[PDB]
Protein backbone atom coordinates (compact mmCIF):
# COMPACT_ATOMS: atom_id res chain seq x y z
CA UNK A 1 0.00 0.00 0.00
CA UNK A 2 2.93 2.26 0.92
CA UNK A 3 0.75 5.39 1.09
CA UNK A 4 -1.11 4.52 4.35
CA UNK A 5 2.13 3.86 6.29
CA UNK A 6 3.63 7.13 5.00
CA UNK A 7 0.62 9.19 6.02
CA UNK A 8 0.31 7.49 9.40
CA UNK A 9 4.00 7.96 10.17
CA UNK A 10 3.66 11.64 9.32
CA UNK A 11 0.54 12.02 11.46
CA UNK A 12 2.18 10.44 14.50
CA UNK A 13 5.41 12.40 14.14
CA UNK A 14 3.71 15.78 13.79
CA UNK A 15 0.43 15.29 15.62
CA UNK A 16 1.78 13.99 18.93
CA UNK A 17 4.11 16.90 19.91
CA UNK A 18 1.59 19.25 18.33
CA UNK A 19 -1.45 17.87 20.12
CA UNK A 20 0.41 17.84 23.43
CA UNK A 21 1.23 21.53 23.08
CA UNK A 22 -2.29 22.28 21.85
CA UNK A 23 -3.76 20.56 24.91
CA UNK A 24 -1.53 22.58 27.22
CA UNK A 25 -2.55 25.79 25.46
CA UNK A 26 -6.22 24.85 25.72
CA UNK A 27 -5.80 24.33 29.46
CA UNK A 28 -4.21 27.75 29.74
CA UNK A 29 -7.14 29.25 27.83
CA UNK A 30 -9.58 27.58 30.23
CA UNK A 31 -7.77 29.03 33.24
CA UNK A 32 -8.32 32.47 31.64
CA UNK A 33 -12.10 31.76 31.48
CA UNK A 34 -12.08 31.47 27.69
CA UNK A 35 -15.07 29.25 26.95
CA UNK A 36 -13.48 27.87 23.80
CA UNK A 37 -10.71 26.25 25.82
CA UNK A 38 -13.00 23.43 26.91
CA UNK A 39 -13.93 22.36 23.39
CA UNK A 40 -10.32 22.57 22.26
CA UNK A 41 -9.21 20.58 25.31
CA UNK A 42 -11.76 17.88 24.52
CA UNK A 43 -10.61 17.74 20.92
CA UNK A 44 -6.98 17.47 22.00
CA UNK A 45 -7.79 14.66 24.44
CA UNK A 46 -9.80 12.74 21.84
CA UNK A 47 -6.86 13.15 19.49
CA UNK A 48 -4.15 12.00 21.90
CA UNK A 49 -6.33 8.98 22.67
CA UNK A 50 -6.71 8.12 18.98
CA UNK A 51 -3.03 8.64 18.08
CA UNK A 52 -1.65 6.41 20.85
CA UNK A 53 -3.12 3.31 19.20
CA UNK A 54 -2.24 4.10 15.57
CA UNK A 55 1.40 2.79 15.77
CA UNK A 56 0.11 -0.76 16.15
CA UNK A 57 -1.81 -0.44 12.91
CA UNK A 58 1.14 1.07 11.17
CA UNK A 59 3.26 -1.86 12.35
CA UNK A 60 0.66 -4.24 10.94
CA UNK A 61 0.88 -2.65 7.48
CA UNK A 62 4.68 -2.31 7.56
CA UNK A 63 5.86 -5.68 8.91
CA UNK A 64 3.08 -8.24 9.25
CA UNK A 65 0.88 -10.44 7.07
CA UNK A 66 -2.20 -10.60 9.31
CA UNK A 67 -3.69 -9.52 12.65
CA UNK A 68 -1.46 -11.48 15.03
CA UNK A 69 -3.10 -9.63 17.95
CA UNK A 70 -6.44 -11.45 17.72
CA UNK A 71 -10.08 -10.40 17.30
CA UNK A 72 -10.12 -8.56 20.63
CA UNK A 73 -7.77 -5.94 19.20
CA UNK A 74 -10.03 -5.08 16.23
CA UNK A 75 -13.00 -4.15 18.44
CA UNK A 76 -11.06 -1.49 20.33
CA UNK A 77 -9.19 -0.08 17.35
CA UNK A 78 -12.39 0.19 15.34
CA UNK A 79 -14.32 1.72 18.23
CA UNK A 80 -11.50 4.10 18.85
CA UNK A 81 -11.43 4.73 15.16
CA UNK A 82 -15.07 5.61 14.94
CA UNK A 83 -14.80 7.64 18.08
CA UNK A 84 -12.00 9.80 16.74
CA UNK A 85 -13.90 10.13 13.50
CA UNK A 86 -17.03 11.51 15.14
CA UNK A 87 -16.09 13.32 18.40
CA UNK A 88 -13.98 15.71 16.39
CA UNK A 89 -16.96 16.44 14.14
CA UNK A 90 -19.28 17.00 17.12
CA UNK A 91 -16.83 19.40 18.73
CA UNK A 92 -16.11 21.38 15.57
CA UNK A 93 -19.87 21.82 15.27
CA UNK A 94 -20.14 22.85 18.93
CA UNK A 95 -17.44 25.47 18.36
CA UNK A 96 -19.19 26.93 15.33
CA UNK A 97 -22.52 27.04 17.19
CA UNK A 98 -20.93 28.68 20.24
CA UNK A 99 -19.42 31.37 18.02
CA UNK A 100 -22.74 32.01 16.35
CA UNK A 101 -24.41 32.43 19.72
CA UNK A 102 -21.59 34.79 20.74
CA UNK A 103 -22.29 36.98 17.68
CA UNK A 104 -26.05 36.77 16.98
CA UNK A 105 -27.43 36.78 20.57
CA UNK A 106 -24.78 38.22 22.91
CA UNK A 107 -27.17 38.78 25.84
CA UNK A 108 -30.17 36.48 25.55
CA UNK A 109 -27.90 33.42 25.55
CA UNK A 110 -25.28 34.73 27.98
CA UNK A 111 -26.19 31.93 30.39
CA UNK A 112 -25.01 29.37 27.87
CA UNK A 113 -21.48 30.78 27.53
CA UNK A 114 -20.24 30.01 31.05
CA UNK A 115 -17.37 27.54 31.45
CA UNK A 116 -19.49 25.27 33.65
CA UNK A 117 -22.03 25.01 30.84
CA UNK A 118 -19.39 24.16 28.24
CA UNK A 119 -18.15 21.41 30.56
CA UNK A 120 -21.65 19.99 31.00
CA UNK A 121 -22.06 20.05 27.22
CA UNK A 122 -18.78 18.20 26.75
CA UNK A 123 -19.87 15.58 29.29
CA UNK A 124 -23.19 15.08 27.50
CA UNK A 125 -21.49 14.81 24.11
CA UNK A 126 -18.97 12.25 25.34
CA UNK A 127 -21.51 10.08 27.15
CA UNK A 128 -24.01 10.19 24.27
CA UNK A 129 -21.51 9.41 21.53
CA UNK A 130 -19.64 6.78 23.45
CA UNK A 131 -22.93 5.07 24.24
CA UNK A 132 -24.21 5.26 20.67
CA UNK A 133 -21.11 3.46 19.36
CA UNK A 134 -20.84 1.08 22.32
CA UNK A 135 -23.12 -1.68 21.01
CA UNK A 136 -20.52 -3.64 18.95
CA UNK A 137 -18.75 -4.20 22.26
CA UNK A 138 -21.80 -5.59 24.01
CA UNK A 139 -22.61 -8.00 21.20
CA UNK A 140 -20.37 -9.63 18.61
CA UNK A 141 -22.73 -10.78 15.87
CA UNK A 142 -22.52 -7.29 14.36
CA UNK A 143 -18.73 -7.03 14.67
CA UNK A 144 -18.49 -10.30 12.79
CA UNK A 145 -21.09 -9.45 10.17
CA UNK A 146 -19.30 -6.15 9.53
CA UNK A 147 -15.65 -7.21 9.84
CA UNK A 148 -13.44 -10.05 8.65
CA UNK A 149 -11.88 -10.99 11.98
CA UNK A 150 -8.71 -12.21 10.22
CA UNK A 151 -7.96 -8.60 9.13
CA UNK A 152 -9.37 -5.48 10.72
CA UNK A 153 -11.19 -4.44 7.52
CA UNK A 154 -14.90 -4.45 6.85
CA UNK A 155 -16.23 -7.16 4.62
CA UNK A 156 -16.09 -6.29 0.96
CA UNK A 157 -19.62 -7.56 0.70
CA UNK A 158 -21.94 -6.10 3.29
CA UNK A 159 -25.14 -7.35 4.86
CA UNK A 160 -28.17 -5.36 5.97
CA UNK A 161 -28.35 -4.61 9.75
CA UNK A 162 -25.33 -2.45 8.89
CA UNK A 163 -26.08 -1.52 5.28
CA UNK A 164 -28.56 1.02 6.65
CA UNK A 165 -26.54 1.93 9.72
CA UNK A 166 -23.86 3.35 7.44
CA UNK A 167 -26.48 5.67 6.00
CA UNK A 168 -27.54 6.70 9.48
CA UNK A 169 -23.86 7.40 10.24
CA UNK A 170 -23.45 9.59 7.16
CA UNK A 171 -26.71 11.52 7.49
CA UNK A 172 -26.50 12.17 11.25
CA UNK A 173 -22.75 11.95 11.87
CA UNK A 174 -21.74 14.21 8.98
CA UNK A 175 -24.44 15.97 6.96
CA UNK A 176 -26.36 17.15 10.03
CA UNK A 177 -23.47 18.86 11.89
CA UNK A 178 -21.95 20.06 8.64
CA UNK A 179 -25.19 21.74 7.62
CA UNK A 180 -25.33 23.23 11.10
CA UNK A 181 -21.83 24.64 10.67
CA UNK A 182 -22.70 26.17 7.29
CA UNK A 183 -25.93 27.59 8.67
CA UNK A 184 -24.04 29.02 11.64
CA UNK A 185 -21.58 30.72 9.29
CA UNK A 186 -24.39 32.21 7.20
CA UNK A 187 -26.18 33.34 10.35
CA UNK A 188 -23.05 35.12 11.53
CA UNK A 189 -22.65 37.02 8.27
CA UNK A 190 -26.33 37.92 8.16
CA UNK A 191 -26.42 39.16 11.77
CA UNK A 192 -23.26 41.20 11.26
CA UNK A 193 -24.41 42.78 8.02
CA UNK A 194 -27.72 43.39 9.64
CA UNK A 195 -25.77 45.08 12.18
CA UNK A 196 -24.81 47.09 9.19
CA UNK A 197 -28.46 47.48 8.46
CA UNK A 198 -29.48 49.41 11.55
CA UNK A 199 -26.71 51.79 12.43
CA UNK A 200 -26.08 53.18 9.02
CA UNK A 201 -29.76 54.07 8.78
CA UNK A 202 -29.52 55.79 12.15
CA UNK A 203 -26.39 57.68 11.29
CA UNK A 204 -27.84 58.98 8.06
CA UNK A 205 -31.02 59.97 9.84
CA UNK A 206 -29.08 61.99 12.36
CA UNK A 207 -26.74 63.60 9.89
CA UNK A 208 -29.29 64.51 7.27
CA UNK A 209 -31.87 65.86 9.65
CA UNK A 210 -29.23 68.04 11.18
CA UNK A 211 -28.48 69.40 7.66
CA UNK A 212 -32.20 70.16 7.33
CA UNK A 213 -32.38 72.04 10.61
CA UNK A 214 -29.57 74.35 9.60
CA UNK A 215 -31.21 75.30 6.30
CA UNK A 216 -34.89 75.20 7.15
CA UNK A 217 -37.12 72.17 12.62
CA UNK A 218 -39.52 70.19 14.83
CA UNK A 219 -39.85 67.49 12.24
CA UNK A 220 -36.15 67.14 11.72
CA UNK A 221 -35.55 67.04 15.49
CA UNK A 222 -38.32 64.49 16.02
CA UNK A 223 -36.63 62.16 13.56
CA UNK A 224 -33.23 62.76 15.11
CA UNK A 225 -34.49 61.82 18.51
CA UNK A 226 -35.86 58.53 17.32
CA UNK A 227 -32.58 57.71 15.61
CA UNK A 228 -30.58 58.63 18.69
CA UNK A 229 -32.67 56.37 20.86
CA UNK A 230 -32.19 53.42 18.52
CA UNK A 231 -28.47 54.08 18.46
CA UNK A 232 -28.48 53.57 22.24
CA UNK A 233 -30.28 50.31 21.82
CA UNK A 234 -27.44 49.24 19.52
CA UNK A 235 -24.96 50.08 22.27
CA UNK A 236 -26.89 47.72 24.51
CA UNK A 237 -26.83 44.84 22.03
CA UNK A 238 -23.24 44.33 23.21
CA UNK A 239 -22.00 43.24 26.71
CA UNK A 240 -20.80 45.93 29.08
CA UNK A 241 -17.39 47.42 28.88
CA UNK A 242 -16.27 51.05 29.64
CA UNK A 243 -16.69 52.11 26.00
CA UNK A 244 -20.32 51.01 25.98
CA UNK A 245 -20.89 52.79 29.22
CA UNK A 246 -19.45 55.91 27.62
CA UNK A 247 -21.44 55.59 24.42
CA UNK A 248 -24.68 55.27 26.37
CA UNK A 249 -23.69 58.37 28.31
CA UNK A 250 -22.87 60.22 25.11
CA UNK A 251 -26.27 59.40 23.76
CA UNK A 252 -28.04 60.60 26.89
CA UNK A 253 -26.27 63.90 26.36
CA UNK A 254 -27.15 63.95 22.66
CA UNK A 255 -30.79 63.18 23.33
CA UNK A 256 -30.99 65.86 25.98
CA UNK A 257 -29.56 68.36 23.49
CA UNK A 258 -32.14 67.32 20.90
CA UNK A 259 -34.79 67.96 23.56
CA UNK A 260 -33.53 71.47 24.25
CA UNK A 261 -33.68 72.23 20.55
CA UNK A 262 -37.25 70.87 20.51
CA UNK A 263 -38.23 73.07 23.40
CA UNK A 264 -37.17 76.08 21.40
CA UNK A 265 -38.86 74.82 18.23
CA UNK A 266 -42.07 74.38 20.25
CA UNK A 267 -41.82 77.92 21.59
CA UNK A 268 -41.38 78.93 17.95
CA UNK A 269 -37.84 80.25 17.99
CA UNK A 270 -36.25 79.00 14.80
CA UNK A 271 -32.94 80.75 15.22
CA UNK A 272 -32.51 79.53 18.75
CA UNK A 273 -33.59 75.98 17.94
CA UNK A 274 -30.99 75.95 15.20
CA UNK A 275 -28.27 77.26 17.51
CA UNK A 276 -29.23 74.53 19.94
CA UNK A 277 -29.15 71.90 17.17
CA UNK A 278 -25.62 73.02 16.31
CA UNK A 279 -24.51 71.79 19.73
CA UNK A 280 -25.28 68.30 18.52
CA UNK A 281 -22.22 68.74 16.27
CA UNK A 282 -20.07 69.64 19.24
CA UNK A 283 -21.33 66.53 21.00
CA UNK A 284 -20.90 64.08 18.15
CA UNK A 285 -17.44 65.39 17.47
CA UNK A 286 -16.44 64.34 20.98
CA UNK A 287 -17.16 60.70 20.20
CA UNK A 288 -15.93 60.31 16.64
CA UNK A 289 -12.52 59.11 17.44
CA UNK A 290 -13.80 56.81 20.10
CA UNK A 291 -16.29 55.28 17.73
CA UNK A 292 -13.70 54.81 15.01
CA UNK A 293 -11.26 53.15 17.35
CA UNK A 294 -14.00 50.97 18.65
CA UNK A 295 -15.02 49.77 15.21
CA UNK A 296 -11.51 48.89 14.24
CA UNK A 297 -11.37 46.62 17.25
CA UNK A 298 -14.56 45.19 15.94
CA UNK A 299 -13.70 44.61 12.19
CA UNK A 300 -10.64 42.66 13.32
CA UNK A 301 -12.69 40.62 15.80
CA UNK A 302 -15.23 39.85 13.11
CA UNK A 303 -12.46 38.97 10.69
CA UNK A 304 -11.17 36.43 13.20
CA UNK A 305 -14.65 35.01 13.80
CA UNK A 306 -15.35 34.66 10.07
CA UNK A 307 -11.95 33.08 9.47
CA UNK A 308 -12.54 30.60 12.29
CA UNK A 309 -15.97 29.60 10.96
CA UNK A 310 -14.59 29.21 7.44
CA UNK A 311 -11.59 27.25 8.68
CA UNK A 312 -13.86 24.86 10.56
CA UNK A 313 -15.93 24.34 7.43
CA UNK A 314 -12.80 23.69 5.37
CA UNK A 315 -11.42 21.27 7.97
CA UNK A 316 -14.58 19.19 8.02
CA UNK A 317 -14.89 19.27 4.22
CA UNK A 318 -11.30 18.21 3.54
CA UNK A 319 -10.63 15.78 6.40
CA UNK A 320 -13.95 13.95 6.55
CA UNK A 321 -16.00 14.47 3.37
CA UNK A 322 -13.92 12.02 1.25
CA UNK A 323 -14.73 9.15 3.59
CA UNK A 324 -18.39 10.04 3.97
CA UNK A 325 -18.76 10.27 0.19
CA UNK A 326 -17.00 6.96 -0.38
CA UNK A 327 -18.91 5.34 2.50
CA UNK A 328 -22.26 6.53 1.14
CA UNK A 329 -21.34 5.41 -2.37
CA UNK A 330 -20.15 2.03 -1.08
CA UNK A 331 -23.40 1.49 0.79
CA UNK A 332 -25.46 2.79 -2.14
CA UNK A 333 -23.64 0.42 -4.53
CA UNK A 334 -25.31 -2.40 -2.62
CA UNK A 335 -28.94 -1.35 -2.20
CA UNK A 336 -29.34 -3.22 -5.46
CA UNK A 337 -27.21 -4.48 -8.30
CA UNK A 338 -17.24 -0.36 -10.94
CA UNK A 339 -17.02 -2.27 -7.67
CA UNK A 340 -13.24 -2.62 -7.29
CA UNK A 341 -12.57 1.08 -7.78
CA UNK A 342 -14.89 1.98 -4.95
CA UNK A 343 -13.12 -0.33 -2.58
CA UNK A 344 -9.62 0.68 -3.52
CA UNK A 345 -10.46 4.37 -3.19
CA UNK A 346 -12.41 3.89 0.04
CA UNK A 347 -9.56 2.13 1.78
CA UNK A 348 -7.03 4.68 0.67
CA UNK A 349 -9.45 7.45 1.75
CA UNK A 350 -9.78 5.90 5.20
CA UNK A 351 -6.15 6.81 5.90
CA UNK A 352 -6.83 10.40 4.82
CA UNK A 353 -9.21 11.07 7.72
CA UNK A 354 -6.27 10.67 10.10
CA UNK A 355 -5.09 14.14 9.06
CA UNK A 356 -7.72 15.64 11.35
CA UNK A 357 -5.27 14.91 14.13
CA UNK A 358 -2.80 17.39 12.60
CA UNK A 359 -5.13 20.13 11.35
CA UNK A 360 -6.96 20.42 14.69
CA UNK A 361 -4.16 22.01 16.73
CA UNK A 362 -3.97 24.76 14.10
CA UNK A 363 -7.22 26.16 15.49
CA UNK A 364 -5.32 27.60 18.45
CA UNK A 365 -3.86 30.30 16.21
CA UNK A 366 -7.42 31.44 15.39
CA UNK A 367 -9.33 31.10 18.65
CA UNK A 368 -7.20 33.34 20.82
CA UNK A 369 -4.24 35.45 19.78
CA UNK A 370 -1.71 33.83 22.06
CA UNK A 371 -0.28 32.46 18.86
CA UNK A 372 1.93 35.53 18.78
CA UNK A 373 2.79 34.96 22.43
CA UNK A 374 3.88 31.41 21.69
CA UNK A 375 5.93 32.62 18.74
CA UNK A 376 7.68 35.06 21.05
CA UNK A 377 8.28 32.26 23.53
CA UNK A 378 9.87 30.15 20.81
CA UNK A 379 12.05 33.04 19.72
CA UNK A 380 13.21 33.45 23.31
CA UNK A 381 13.98 29.75 23.61
CA UNK A 382 16.06 30.13 20.47
Amino acid at each position, epitope marked *: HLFPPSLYIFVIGVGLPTNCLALWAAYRQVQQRNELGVYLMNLSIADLLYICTLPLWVDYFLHHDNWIHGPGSCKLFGFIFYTNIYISIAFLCCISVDRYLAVAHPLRFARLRRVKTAVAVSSVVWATELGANSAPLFHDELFRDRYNHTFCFEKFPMEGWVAWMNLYRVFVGFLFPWALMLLSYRGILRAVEKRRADLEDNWETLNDNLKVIEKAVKDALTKMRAAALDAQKATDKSPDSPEMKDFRHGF*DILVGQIDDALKLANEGKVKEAQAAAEQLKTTRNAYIQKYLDWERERLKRLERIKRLALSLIAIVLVCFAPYHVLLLSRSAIYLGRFEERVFSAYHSSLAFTSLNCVADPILYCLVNEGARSDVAKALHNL
Partner: antibody
Amino acid sequence: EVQLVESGGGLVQPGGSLRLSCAASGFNVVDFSLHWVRQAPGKGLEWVAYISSSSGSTSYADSVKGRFTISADTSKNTAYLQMNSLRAEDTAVYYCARWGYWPGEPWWKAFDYWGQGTLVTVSS
Amino acid sequence: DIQMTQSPSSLSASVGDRVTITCRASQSVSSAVAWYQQKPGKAPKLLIYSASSLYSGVPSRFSGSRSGTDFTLTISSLQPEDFATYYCQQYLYYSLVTFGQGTKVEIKR
Protein backbone atom coordinates in the same frame (compact mmCIF):
# COMPACT_ATOMS: atom_id res chain seq x y z
CA GLU B 1 -47.91 55.01 48.37
CA VAL B 2 -47.92 56.59 44.81
CA GLN B 3 -51.07 58.53 44.01
CA LEU B 4 -52.47 61.02 41.57
CA VAL B 5 -55.80 62.41 42.62
CA GLU B 6 -57.98 64.48 40.36
CA SER B 7 -60.67 66.86 41.45
CA GLY B 8 -62.57 69.91 40.22
CA GLY B 9 -64.64 68.39 37.44
CA GLY B 10 -68.33 69.04 37.04
CA LEU B 11 -70.78 70.84 34.85
CA VAL B 12 -69.85 73.99 33.02
CA GLN B 13 -71.75 75.95 30.38
CA PRO B 14 -70.16 76.48 26.93
CA GLY B 15 -67.76 79.37 27.02
CA GLY B 16 -67.26 78.93 30.75
CA SER B 17 -64.35 77.55 32.66
CA LEU B 18 -63.12 74.97 35.14
CA ARG B 19 -59.94 74.52 37.10
CA LEU B 20 -59.03 70.90 37.51
CA SER B 21 -56.60 69.86 40.16
CA CYS B 22 -54.21 66.87 40.41
CA ALA B 23 -52.86 66.29 43.88
CA ALA B 24 -49.83 64.12 44.36
CA SER B 25 -48.83 61.76 47.15
CA GLY B 26 -45.66 59.67 47.55
CA PHE B 27 -43.85 61.59 44.85
CA ASN B 28 -43.69 65.29 44.34
CA VAL B 29 -45.09 67.14 41.34
CA VAL B 30 -41.58 68.40 40.62
CA ASP B 31 -40.24 64.85 40.38
CA PHE B 32 -41.99 63.97 37.13
CA SER B 33 -43.85 65.29 34.14
CA LEU B 34 -47.58 65.57 34.43
CA HIS B 35 -49.87 64.87 31.65
CA TRP B 36 -53.48 65.24 31.07
CA VAL B 37 -55.14 62.65 28.95
CA ARG B 38 -58.66 63.01 27.83
CA GLN B 39 -61.25 60.42 27.06
CA ALA B 40 -64.42 61.60 25.42
CA PRO B 41 -67.36 59.29 26.15
CA GLY B 42 -67.19 56.31 23.82
CA LYS B 43 -63.81 57.37 22.41
CA GLY B 44 -60.19 56.43 22.75
CA LEU B 45 -57.61 58.40 24.63
CA GLU B 46 -56.31 61.81 23.55
CA TRP B 47 -53.27 63.47 24.95
CA VAL B 48 -54.16 67.02 26.03
CA ALA B 49 -51.46 68.77 27.95
CA TYR B 50 -48.09 68.54 29.56
CA ILE B 51 -46.17 70.23 32.26
CA SER B 52 -42.72 69.79 33.64
CA SER B 53 -42.31 72.02 36.65
CA SER B 54 -38.68 71.05 36.88
CA SER B 55 -37.95 72.90 33.60
CA GLY B 56 -40.95 75.23 33.21
CA SER B 57 -41.98 73.49 30.02
CA THR B 58 -45.51 73.08 28.88
CA SER B 59 -47.30 71.97 25.80
CA TYR B 60 -50.75 71.45 24.50
CA ALA B 61 -52.60 69.40 21.98
CA ASP B 62 -53.56 71.46 18.95
CA SER B 63 -57.21 70.98 19.81
CA VAL B 64 -56.82 73.05 23.01
CA LYS B 65 -54.07 75.57 22.17
CA GLY B 66 -54.77 79.02 23.53
CA ARG B 67 -57.74 77.64 25.38
CA PHE B 68 -56.17 75.63 28.18
CA THR B 69 -53.44 76.71 30.59
CA ILE B 70 -51.44 74.18 32.54
CA SER B 71 -49.62 75.09 35.70
CA ALA B 72 -48.37 73.63 38.93
CA ASP B 73 -47.62 74.60 42.48
CA THR B 74 -45.13 72.33 44.09
CA SER B 75 -45.58 73.87 47.54
CA LYS B 76 -48.93 72.05 47.77
CA ASN B 77 -47.66 69.21 45.67
CA THR B 78 -50.56 69.91 43.30
CA ALA B 79 -50.90 70.52 39.56
CA TYR B 80 -53.69 72.32 37.77
CA LEU B 81 -55.38 72.50 34.38
CA GLN B 82 -57.26 75.70 33.64
CA MET B 83 -59.85 75.13 31.03
CA ASN B 84 -61.20 78.36 29.54
CA SER B 85 -63.66 78.97 26.75
CA LEU B 86 -64.92 75.41 26.83
CA ARG B 87 -66.72 73.87 23.91
CA ALA B 88 -69.16 70.96 23.82
CA GLU B 89 -66.38 68.87 22.27
CA ASP B 90 -64.35 69.13 25.47
CA THR B 91 -66.68 66.82 27.37
CA ALA B 92 -64.53 64.00 28.59
CA VAL B 93 -62.99 62.24 31.46
CA TYR B 94 -59.76 63.97 32.24
CA TYR B 95 -57.03 61.85 33.70
CA CYS B 96 -53.80 63.08 35.28
CA ALA B 97 -50.82 60.84 34.54
CA ARG B 98 -47.24 60.45 35.66
CA TRP B 99 -44.31 60.04 33.25
CA GLY B 100 -40.77 60.55 34.51
CA TYR B 101 -37.73 62.27 33.16
CA TRP B 102 -35.08 61.17 30.75
CA PRO B 103 -32.57 59.34 31.13
CA GLY B 104 -33.45 55.84 32.19
CA GLU B 105 -36.39 53.75 33.28
CA PRO B 106 -38.61 56.58 34.65
CA TRP B 107 -38.90 57.75 31.04
CA TRP B 108 -39.18 54.38 29.33
CA LYS B 109 -41.89 53.46 31.73
CA ALA B 110 -44.42 55.91 30.53
CA PHE B 111 -47.76 56.59 32.06
CA ASP B 112 -47.17 54.33 35.00
CA TYR B 113 -49.51 56.10 37.25
CA TRP B 114 -52.84 57.45 36.37
CA GLY B 115 -55.20 59.15 38.61
CA GLN B 116 -58.83 58.24 38.93
CA GLY B 117 -60.00 60.76 36.39
CA THR B 118 -62.62 63.44 36.64
CA LEU B 119 -65.53 64.20 34.40
CA VAL B 120 -65.97 67.49 32.70
CA THR B 121 -69.27 67.95 31.00
CA VAL B 122 -69.84 71.02 28.91
CA SER B 123 -73.44 71.79 28.21
CA SER B 124 -75.96 74.56 28.00
CA ASP C 1 -48.49 63.81 13.91
CA ILE C 2 -47.13 60.24 14.54
CA GLN C 3 -50.23 58.22 14.12
CA MET C 4 -50.60 54.69 15.35
CA THR C 5 -53.07 52.26 13.83
CA GLN C 6 -54.43 49.22 15.57
CA SER C 7 -55.80 46.61 13.23
CA PRO C 8 -58.17 44.30 15.21
CA SER C 9 -60.52 46.99 16.56
CA SER C 10 -62.61 44.18 17.98
CA LEU C 11 -61.26 40.75 18.67
CA SER C 12 -63.28 37.79 19.89
CA ALA C 13 -61.49 35.15 21.90
CA SER C 14 -62.22 32.30 24.31
CA VAL C 15 -60.90 31.99 27.81
CA GLY C 16 -57.59 30.18 27.46
CA ASP C 17 -57.26 31.37 23.86
CA ARG C 18 -54.33 33.07 22.14
CA VAL C 19 -54.75 36.77 21.36
CA THR C 20 -52.64 38.95 19.11
CA ILE C 21 -53.15 42.68 18.72
CA THR C 22 -51.16 44.45 16.00
CA CYS C 23 -50.35 48.23 15.94
CA ARG C 24 -48.53 50.12 13.18
CA ALA C 25 -46.59 53.35 13.48
CA SER C 26 -46.83 55.88 10.66
CA GLN C 27 -43.13 56.51 10.95
CA SER C 28 -40.19 55.22 12.79
CA VAL C 29 -40.67 55.04 16.50
CA SER C 30 -37.90 53.52 18.59
CA SER C 31 -39.08 50.83 20.94
CA ALA C 32 -41.20 53.52 22.65
CA VAL C 33 -44.54 51.89 22.39
CA ALA C 34 -46.51 51.01 25.42
CA TRP C 35 -49.57 48.96 25.86
CA TYR C 36 -52.34 49.81 28.30
CA GLN C 37 -55.31 47.88 29.61
CA GLN C 38 -58.51 49.76 30.29
CA LYS C 39 -61.55 48.33 31.94
CA PRO C 40 -64.83 50.30 31.88
CA GLY C 41 -64.92 53.06 34.46
CA LYS C 42 -61.21 52.83 35.24
CA ALA C 43 -58.09 54.68 34.32
CA PRO C 44 -55.77 52.69 32.00
CA LYS C 45 -53.13 50.44 33.51
CA LEU C 46 -49.70 50.00 31.97
CA LEU C 47 -48.93 46.47 30.84
CA ILE C 48 -45.94 46.73 28.55
CA TYR C 49 -43.41 49.44 28.13
CA SER C 50 -40.60 49.91 25.64
CA ALA C 51 -42.51 47.59 23.27
CA SER C 52 -41.37 44.62 25.31
CA SER C 53 -40.85 44.65 29.06
CA LEU C 54 -43.61 44.02 31.53
CA TYR C 55 -44.51 46.47 34.14
CA SER C 56 -44.17 45.04 37.61
CA GLY C 57 -47.36 43.37 38.76
CA VAL C 58 -48.48 42.49 35.26
CA PRO C 59 -49.05 38.75 34.64
CA SER C 60 -46.61 36.78 32.48
CA ARG C 61 -49.49 36.07 30.13
CA PHE C 62 -48.68 39.40 28.50
CA SER C 63 -45.81 39.98 26.12
CA GLY C 64 -45.04 42.03 23.05
CA SER C 65 -42.46 43.04 20.50
CA ARG C 66 -41.32 45.38 17.74
CA SER C 67 -40.53 44.65 14.11
CA GLY C 68 -39.66 47.90 12.40
CA THR C 69 -42.81 50.03 12.75
CA ASP C 70 -45.04 47.05 13.57
CA PHE C 71 -45.74 46.46 17.22
CA THR C 72 -47.67 43.62 18.77
CA LEU C 73 -49.33 42.70 22.02
CA THR C 74 -49.83 39.06 22.76
CA ILE C 75 -51.84 37.44 25.47
CA SER C 76 -50.61 33.89 25.60
CA SER C 77 -53.75 32.61 27.28
CA LEU C 78 -56.72 34.81 28.12
CA GLN C 79 -57.91 34.81 31.64
CA PRO C 80 -61.43 35.93 32.64
CA GLU C 81 -59.79 39.15 33.88
CA ASP C 82 -58.32 40.15 30.50
CA PHE C 83 -61.40 41.20 28.67
CA ALA C 84 -60.48 44.83 28.37
CA THR C 85 -59.74 47.51 25.83
CA TYR C 86 -56.11 47.60 24.93
CA TYR C 87 -54.40 50.71 23.74
CA CYS C 88 -51.22 51.18 21.70
CA GLN C 89 -49.32 54.27 22.63
CA GLN C 90 -46.42 56.17 21.12
CA TYR C 91 -44.05 58.01 23.47
CA LEU C 92 -41.20 59.61 21.56
CA TYR C 93 -41.64 62.95 23.23
CA TYR C 94 -43.79 64.67 25.82
CA SER C 95 -45.62 66.78 23.22
CA LEU C 96 -45.92 64.06 20.56
CA VAL C 97 -47.90 61.56 22.49
CA THR C 98 -50.46 59.72 20.47
CA PHE C 99 -52.64 56.73 21.04
CA GLY C 100 -54.00 54.15 18.70
CA GLN C 101 -57.74 53.88 18.65
CA GLY C 102 -57.81 50.86 20.94
CA THR C 103 -58.83 47.27 20.41
CA LYS C 104 -61.42 45.57 22.45
CA VAL C 105 -61.15 41.94 23.41
CA GLU C 106 -64.58 40.41 23.63
CA ILE C 107 -65.59 37.03 24.95
CA LYS C 108 -66.13 34.58 22.10
CA ARG C 109 -69.48 32.98 21.74
